[PDB]
Amino acid sequence: GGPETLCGAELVDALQFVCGDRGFYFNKPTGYGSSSRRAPQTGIVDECCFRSCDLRRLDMYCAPLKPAKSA
């Protein structure tokens, strides 16, 4: 029962809804540079759980999306 925030099972559920049946994945703990380490890039759960992550940004963790019109 946080201050109108998403964290825990509820947070995961929101991710599934936003991402859809497509699913989602988690970014690696390390990549390039040390700036990412300083920032809360450890996990999407911690970012939303602690800080207030926007729905639009949250969609980034969702799986790739394709256009309505086939290419």
Keywords:
71 residues; mainly alpha; Insulin-like, subunit E; 4 helices; 0% strand
State the gist of this model.
This protein has 71 residues and is an all-alpha fold. It has 4 helices and no strands.
Can you give a write-up of this model?
The chain has 71 residues and is an all-alpha fold. It has a single domain (1-71), classed as Orthogonal Bundle (Insulin-like, subunit E). 37% of the residues lie in helices and 0% in strands. It is flat, with a radius of gyration of 14 Å. The relative contact order is 0.23.
The CATH homologous superfamily is called Insulin-like
* Strands, total number: 0
What percent of the residues sit in helical stretches (DSSP H or I)?
25-40%
Helix and strand pattern: HHHH
Subunit structure: Forms a ternary complex with IGFR1 and ITGAV:ITGB3. Forms a ternary complex with IGFR1 and ITGA6:ITGB4. Interacts with SH2D3C isoform 2. Forms a ternary complex with IGFBP3 and ALS.
Region (A): 43-63
Family: Belongs to the insulin family.
Disulfide bonds: 7-49, 19-62, 48-53
Secondary structure topology:
Blueprint: H1 9-19, H2 35-38, H3 44-50, H4 55-58
Main location: secreted
GO molecular function, one term: hormone activity
Region (C): 31-42
